[PDB]
Structures are given as C-alpha cells and as structure tokens.
Amino acid sequence: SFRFCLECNNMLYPKEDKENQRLLYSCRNCDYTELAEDPKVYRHELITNIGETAGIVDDIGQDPTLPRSDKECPECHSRDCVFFQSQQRRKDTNMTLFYVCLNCKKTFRDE
C-alpha cells in the first residue's frame, strides 16, 4: 500500500534527501512531497500462507453445498457450523479445515 498524491492523485515513490538524510514519498507529476517514516518498502515472499481465510461473507451460512458439522464454537459453543478448506490454489496447500459458526458467523480453526 503506497500513498497517493493530493492534487493529481498519483502514487508516490521513495526518495533520499541529503541535508536531513530522510526518506520521503515524492511525486514526479507535481512538486508534492511528504515525510516517510517506514523503511519497510519492498516485500516479496517465496512461500506464503496468506489467503487461506477466503472471502467469507455473512451470507455464507445458507449455502447448501457446504458440508455441516457439530464442532465446538469457541465463545458461543454452538452445535451448528459449516466447514471447508483453503481457497488457495497453491500446489503445496495443506488440508487443514476451516470452520465457520452460524449463531455468531465467525471463523475458528482447530488450534
């Protein structure tokens, strides 16, 4: 997530400033700059497990194709819940199950 400009609405870029040796977000379309307090700029992970939660919506409770179980909910201890697997299409995706309750409609794993 990179910050955007204010008058031309363009994303900014890191740049080094020498008299105060500061990292700043700058725009080339115009002359708008701002201070950058985060050295964290580039992220590239070879193996990730982000996205296993999937796009769960409050309307997932009435899907008839999803299997139904009777697992113990953490907070409301409901006996009605559904379960599925990770949405990620990675080759090495694990088979850990994801459970969603019905009274509170929130997720919980086996951990």
Partner 1 sequence: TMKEITHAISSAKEQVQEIIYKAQHNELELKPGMTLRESFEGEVSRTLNDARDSAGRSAEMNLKDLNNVKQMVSAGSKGSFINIAQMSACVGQQMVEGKRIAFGFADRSLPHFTKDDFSPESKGFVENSYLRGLTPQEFFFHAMAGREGLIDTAVKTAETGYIQRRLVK
Partner 2 sequence: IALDIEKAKVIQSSIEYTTLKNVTSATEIYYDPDPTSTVIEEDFDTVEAYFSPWLLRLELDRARMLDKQLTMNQVADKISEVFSDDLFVMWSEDNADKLIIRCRVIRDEEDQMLKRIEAHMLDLIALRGIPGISKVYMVKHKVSV
Partner 3 sequence: DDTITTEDCWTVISAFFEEKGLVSQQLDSFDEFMETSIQDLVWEEPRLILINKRYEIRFGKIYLSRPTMTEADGTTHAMFPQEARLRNLTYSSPVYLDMEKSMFTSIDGNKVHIGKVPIMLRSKFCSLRTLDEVDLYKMKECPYDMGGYFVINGSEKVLIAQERSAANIVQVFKKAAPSPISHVAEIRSALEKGSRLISTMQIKLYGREDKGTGRTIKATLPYVKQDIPIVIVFRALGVVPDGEILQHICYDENDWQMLEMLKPCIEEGFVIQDKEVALDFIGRRGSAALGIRREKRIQYAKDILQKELLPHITQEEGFETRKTFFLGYMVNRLLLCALERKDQDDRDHFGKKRLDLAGPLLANLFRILFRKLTREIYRYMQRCIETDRDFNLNLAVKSTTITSGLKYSLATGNWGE
Q: Note whether 78 and 101 are within 8 A (CB).
A: yes
Tokens at 1, concatenated:
């997530």
Site string for partner 2, 22-61 (x = CB under 8 A): xx------------x--xxxxxxxxx--------------
**Closest CB to partner 2 among residues 21, 62:** 21
Q: Which of residues 61-90 bind partner 1 (CB under 8 A)?
A: 65-67, 83-85
Q: Tell me how far, at minimum, the Cβ of 66 lies from partner 1, in Å.
A: 6
Contacts of 26 (CB under 8 A, 6+ apart): 12, 13, 14, 15, 32, 33
Q: Is 30 annotated as a binding residue?
A: yes
The sheet with strand 68-69 has its strands ordered as 68-69, 81-84, 98-101, 107-108
Q: Which residues are annotated as a binding site for Zn(2+)?
A: 5-8, 27, 30, 73, 76, 101, 103-104
